[PDB]
């Protein structure tokens, strides 16, 4: 599943990315610690209004 890292995760990606990972690791551990959220249009908008 595509997510946009809000955080680096050494080996896996670096905060401002948008990329596509492993649906257990997503799940169970980046979305879990709030190092990414899915990237879906929704988000996306709303991640740029937090940002901004
Ligand atoms: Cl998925
Ligand atoms: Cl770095
Ligand atoms: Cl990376
Ligand atoms: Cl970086
Ligand atoms: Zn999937
Ligand atoms: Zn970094
Ligand atoms: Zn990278
Ligand atoms: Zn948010």
Same mark, same amino acid.
């Given at each position: 599943?595509?997510?946009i890292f809000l955080k680096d995760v050494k %080996?896996?990606?670096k905060k401002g990315?948008? &990329?596509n990972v492993?649906? %257990?690791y997503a799940?169970?551990?980046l979305? &879990?610690?709030x190092l990414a959220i899915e990237a879906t249009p929704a988000n996306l908008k709303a991640l740029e209004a937090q940002k901004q």
């Open positions: 599943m595509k997510v %080996g896996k990606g990315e948008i &990329k492993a649906d %257990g799940n169970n551990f979305f &879990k610690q």
